Amino acid sequence: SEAQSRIQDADYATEVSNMSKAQIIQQAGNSVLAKANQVPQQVLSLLQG
Amino acid sequence: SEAQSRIQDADYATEVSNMSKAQIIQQAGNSVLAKANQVPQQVLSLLQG
Amino acid sequence: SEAQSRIQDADYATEVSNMSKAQIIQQAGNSVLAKANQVPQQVLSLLQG
Amino acid sequence: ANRFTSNIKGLTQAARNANDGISVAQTTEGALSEINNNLQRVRELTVQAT
Amino acid sequence: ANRFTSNIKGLTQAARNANDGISVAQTTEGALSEINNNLQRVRELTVQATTGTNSESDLSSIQDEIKSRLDEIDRVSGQTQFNGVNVLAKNGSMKIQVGANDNQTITIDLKQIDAKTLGLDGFSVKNTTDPLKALDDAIASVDKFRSSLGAVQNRLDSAVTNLNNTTTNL
Amino acid sequence: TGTNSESDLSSIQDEIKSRLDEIDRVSGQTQFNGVNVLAKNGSMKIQVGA
Amino acid sequence: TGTNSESDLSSIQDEIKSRLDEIDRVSGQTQFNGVNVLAKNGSMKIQVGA
Amino acid sequence: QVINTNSLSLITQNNINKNQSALSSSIERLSSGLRINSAKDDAAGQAI
Amino acid sequence: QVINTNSLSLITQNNINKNQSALSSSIERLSSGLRINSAKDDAAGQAI
Numbered sequence: 417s418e419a420q421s422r423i424q425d426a427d428y429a430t431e432v433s434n435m436s437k438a439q440i441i442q443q444a445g446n447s448v449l450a451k452a453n454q455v456p457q458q459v460l461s462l463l464q465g
Numbered sequence: 466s467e468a469q470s471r472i473q474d475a476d477y478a479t480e481v482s483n484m485s486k487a488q489i490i491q492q493a494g495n496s497v498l499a500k501a502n503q504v505p506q507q508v509l510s511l512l513q514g
Numbered sequence: 515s516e517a518q519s520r521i522q523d524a525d526y527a528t529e530v531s532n533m534s535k536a537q538i539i540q541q542a543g544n545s546v547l548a549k550a551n552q553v554p555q556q557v558l559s560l561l562q563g
Numbered sequence: 564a565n566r567f568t569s570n571i572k573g574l575t576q577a578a579r580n581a582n583d584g585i586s587v588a589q590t591t592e593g594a595l596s597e598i599n600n601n602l603q604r605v606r607e608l609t610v611q612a613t
Numbered sequence: 614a615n616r617f618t619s620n621i622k623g624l625t626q627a628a629r630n631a632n633d634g635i636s637v638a639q640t641t642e643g644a645l646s647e648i649n650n651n652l653q654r655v656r657e658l659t660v661q662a663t664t665g666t667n668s669e670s671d672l673s674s675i676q677d678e679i680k681s682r683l684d685e686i687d688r689v690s691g692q693t694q695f696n697g698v699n700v701l702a703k704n705g706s707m708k709i710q711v712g713a714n715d716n717q718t719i720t721i722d723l724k725q726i727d728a729k730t731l732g733l734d735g736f737s738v739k740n741t742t743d744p745l746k747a748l749d750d751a752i753a754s755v756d757k758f759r760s761s762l763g764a765v766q767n768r769l770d771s772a773v774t775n776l777n778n779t780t781t782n783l
Numbered sequence: 784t785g786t787n788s789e790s791d792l793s794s795i796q797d798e799i800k801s802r803l804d805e806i807d808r809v810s811g812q813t814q815f816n817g818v819n820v821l822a823k824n825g826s827m828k829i830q831v832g833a
Numbered sequence: 834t835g836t837n838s839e840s841d842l843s844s845i846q847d848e849i850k851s852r853l854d855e856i857d858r859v860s861g862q863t864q865f866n867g868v869n870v871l872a873k874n875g876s877m878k879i880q881v882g883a
Numbered sequence: 884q885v886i887n888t889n890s891l892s893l894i895t896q897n898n899i900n901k902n903q904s905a906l907s908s909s910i911e912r913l914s915s916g917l918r919i920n921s922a923k924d925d926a927a928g929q930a931i
Numbered sequence: 932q933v934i935n936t937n938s939l940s941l942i943t944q945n946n947i948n949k950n951q952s953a954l955s956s957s958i959e960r961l962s963s964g965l966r967i968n969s970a971k972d973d974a975a976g977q978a979i
Contacts, residue, residue: 423928426918431909438906445899449478452891453485459886460489463496468636469567470936477932478899482892484549489886495556499563517586527947531940538934566696592970616866633786642922661975671975678974697788707785712862718785719858753840756930760844763922764851770904770923771855777900779863781893841927848926907939914943 620783623713628776631769634709634721638766641700641723644693645759648726649752651686655679656748662738663745672739683728683736690727701726711772719772721765724758731755 661667662675690701704725708718728734731751738744787795810821837845860871911920919929959968967977 423931424917424919426912426916428913431913434905435909435913438902438909441902442899442906445895445902446478449482449892449895449899452889452895453482455891456486456489456884456886456889459884460492460496462884463493466571466936466941467938468633468640469564469571470933470938471632471636472567473564474933474935477934478896482889482896486886486889491556492559493886495559499560503563517583517590520582520586527944531937531944535934535937542934589969630784630786633784637786639921667975671978674975674978696786709786710784714862717862721785753930757840757844759922760847760926760930763924763926764848766921766923767848768851768855771852774901775859777897781890781897783865837927838931841930844927844930910939911942914939914946916946 617783620713621780624776624780624783627711627713627717628773628780631709631711631719631773631776634707634719635766635769635773637695637700637707638721638762638769640693640695642759642762642766644689644701645726645755645762647689648686649755649759651682651689652748652752652755655682656745656752658682659738659744659748669739676737676739679736679738683733686733687728690725709769711769711776719765719768722761726755726758 658675658679662672662679667675691699693699693701700723702725703723705723707721707723709721710717711719724730728736731754732747733751735741736744736747741747811819813819813821861869863869863871912918919925922929960966967973970977
């Protein structure tokens with residue numbers, strides 16, 4: 417049973433750290449996507465004058 | 466259920482990006498239309514002298 | 515009594531998840547409605563010049 | 564997607580139905596346990612009487 | 614540009630297609646997991662039954678439970694269908710279009726998993742020689758199919774990532 | 784794709800046949816100055832000299 | 834590793850062979866503008882002058 | 884200045900899609916408590 | 932990013948439902964004091 421635990425069970429500390437890092441990455445990517453979609457707005461300024 | 470989600474549901478990132486691009490295209494087209502309608506004014510200058 | 519509970523009582527995990535999802539959908543719909551009402555403004559620019 | 568939704572609803576309803584069968588089996592098992600206790604006491608009484 | 618647009622549309626459609634194969638493999642793997650649990654319980658039952666302490670009625674009850682779980686295995690095999698395809702009812706294969714041109718398929722394999730194709734046809738513990746060996750053989754034979762399904766899932770995921778990158782570049 | 788059932792293939796073929804019929808329609812119908820340009824192999828000669 | 838049995842080695846080899854086939858497929862099918870770049874040693878000449 | 888293609892947005896979406904898998908796997912492992920939840924994970928450890 | 936389906940939540944609910952049975956059985960065995968509280972447990976041990 418202890419061997420099966422050493423094979424299949426997960427370490428909660430590592431999983432928590434990875435999940436927190438993934439959440440931070442997701443929010444950062446969302447913000448960067450917002451900035452990227454905001455970038456092309458200067459063409460409207462070009463056409464307007 | 467997750468298969469049905471992978472089939473019918475939409476990814477909001479792509480939809481938001483396409484919506485922003487479409488809005489920019491619409492505004493640019495409106496500006497170019499205004500310029501195109503302003504083009505024919507030179508005939509009035511020709512007739513004026 | 516257990517048989518009645520298996521029929522008439524609710525499962526709180528599912529209800530909470532559905533509540534959260536419904537609230538997210540409602541706020542998303544409100545934002546999309548605001549943008550949809552914002553869309554027709556381009557005709558004002560068309561008329562202005 | 565229409566077929567998938569049909570399958571999802573059918574499976575949910577099927578699980579709901581199976582819960583009823585589990586309940587029926589539980590009730591019958593309880594009744595049988597009481598009958599077993601009565602039969603055991605009857606056997607003890609017969610042992611005393613013979 | 615015309616050829617580029619054709620390639621973009623084809624590759625996007627191919628990624629969408631690969632998602633379907635991923636879903637098929639996931640569903641089949643879930644069904645296999647349930648079958649594995651039933652087989653494990655049956656093995657425990659046989660271990661309990663092959664003892665001299667048990668009387669004939671006890672063996673009859675154990676056989677009743679074992680037969681019920683075997684019928685459950687057979688039912689889960691037969692009834693489980695995905696998109697009107699009984700995956701665990703006949704040896705076959707699927708060809709997942711993961712490319713823009715023709716003959717761009719990743720082959721998924723499906724094995725008929727049931728009592729007949731596992732050696733557990735007529736498995737009884739009352740009035741079968743070497744029951745535990747046959748049960749272990751069936752467990753390993755479903756584990757092999759599960760491993761193949763997992764490998765196919767990994768291949769499909771890698772394909773989806775590559776198609777996404779290629780579509781972006783083109 | 785192998786996941787598609789027969790009805791799905793039927794729907795896809797229906798739509799494809801509709802678009803092919805549309806292509807044939809647009810080919811046959813387009814007419815410039817009483818000339819069906821995309822209906823017959825031919826040639827036009829434009830006088831660009833005196 | 835010595836702890837792995839023959840069935841475990843078979844499963845690992847199955848996954849390895851699948852990934853090698855995926856590598857070969859990605860190599861063969863990667864085509865740009867009707868050119869299979871990762872399928873044959875060659876060279877392209879880009880005109881960067883007048 | 885192209886407004887018919889937003890390549891940067893495509894790159895960002897690709898990175899987000901790449902990230903999604905790690906988050907999904909981490910949450911699944913935390914919920915189940917088992918590192919091996921499917922044959923895609925190891926399946927040799929799963930057979931053992 | 933899908934907000935119409937919450938697959939991860941479904942997995943978590945499935946795991947919780949799986950766990951419920953062990954807790955229920957353990958509490959029943961602790962309260963009653965007998966390992967075989969019903970026929971679904973063993974029923975061979977129960978007949979004996």
